[PDB]
Design a protein around this ligand. Structure first.
Ligand SMILES: CCN(CC)[C@@H](C)CNC(=O)c1cc(-c2cnn3ccc(-c4cccs4)nc23)nc(N2CC[C@H]2C(=O)NC)c1
Length: 290
């Protein structure tokens, strides 16, 4: 009965609902993921127990921070620290200066959170812009990876067909083939996001979802002129190593954190403003919210 007694519920933030709330004792504000637990199957009870366990384990500057896990009658509450910077992609389209260096800084933080997940045997499986939140500018504006409702626990490099999961534009070739998979599926999603961060449109796309899947399984993206002519070759190289259809050859999160475009940002990444990326990303964000 701890949540109904100690928290005041506010407006909705986004099989669950996320609502802002305030702890009545201290006045601190939080984000509460509310899950209806009535008439759940044994399989449903185990998925929710897995989610609360994963959220309790992951403590990292670039991951949402679990504050409390409260089980009342009919409902379960996962209470996180409230981040107020908004979605990452909405913050980028509001910038008047945005360069490769800024994209490298964003993807470095995302890579840090994915690396932290993989070191703890967790594969997120659903990396996408809607799961990339921001701390407030007054708090450092760190990128925050959110929502582990679809995450799985793996043993080292053990890989199997853990079933389907993910969002069409970010699905890896091995999941589309129904092959066994594991950690590299998060790195493929990181490659799609890095592509979007540079030009503001996705590398694989077709209004026909089946043709979208055909392009993904072929790994057939490209860097068309003119917008890619000003992108450094090192940035293109990192995308190449992330969007490799062979999951064994695909770069890992810790390997990616040592790529020169990541760890040598000020001397390798271009500092030129990319206005066309901001304009395309405005179109990208509009379609995603339908
Ligand atoms: C990412 C989750 N999922 C659903 C489950 C997507 C699809 C929906 N989106 C949300 O539920 C959501 C959560 C938060 C949020 C804010 N702090 N926070 C802390 C923890 C979490 C989560 C932890 C686990 C799942 S969500 N979400 C948030 N902030 C949101 N906003 C929109 C801009 C920003 C904003 O500033 N609006 C005043 C949306």
């Amino acid at each position: 009965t701890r949540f109904t007694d100690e928290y005041q519920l506010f407006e909705e933030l986004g099989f669950s609902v996320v609502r802002r709330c305030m702890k009545i004792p201290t006045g601190q504000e939080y984000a509460a993921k509310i899950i209806n637990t009535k008439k759940l199957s044994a399989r449903d009870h185990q998925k929710l127990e897995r989610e609360a366990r994963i959220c309790r384990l992951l403590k990292h500057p670039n991951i949402v921070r679990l504050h409390d896990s409260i089980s009342e009658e009919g409902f379960h509450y996962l209470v996180f620290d409230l981040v107020t910077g908004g979605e990452l992609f909405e913050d980028i389209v509001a910038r008047e200066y945005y360069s490769e260096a800024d994209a490298s800084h964003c993807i470095q933080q995302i890579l840090e959170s994915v690396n932290h997940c993989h070191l703890n045997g967790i594969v997120h499986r659903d990396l996408k812009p809607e799961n990339l939140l921001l701390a407030s500018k007054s708090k450092g504006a760190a990128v925050k990876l959110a929502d582990f409702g679809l995450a799985i626990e793996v043993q080292g490099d053990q890989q199997a067909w853990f079933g389907f999961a993910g969002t069409p534009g970010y699905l890896s070739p091995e999941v589309l083939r129904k092959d066994p998979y594991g950690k590299p599926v998060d790195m493929w999603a990181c490659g799609v996001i890095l592509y979007i961060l540079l030009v503001g449109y996705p590398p694989f796309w077709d209004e026909d979802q089946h043709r979208l899947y055909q392009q993904i399984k072929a790994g057939a993206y490209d860097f068309p002129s003119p917008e890619w002519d000003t992108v450094t070759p090192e940035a293109k190289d990192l995308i190449n190593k992330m969007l490799t259809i062979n999951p064994a050859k695909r770069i890992t999160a810790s390997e990616a954190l040592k790529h020169p475009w990541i760890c040598q940002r000020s001397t390798v990444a271009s500092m030129m403003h990319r206005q066309e990326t901001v304009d395309c990303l405005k179109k990208f964000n509009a379609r995603r919210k339908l």
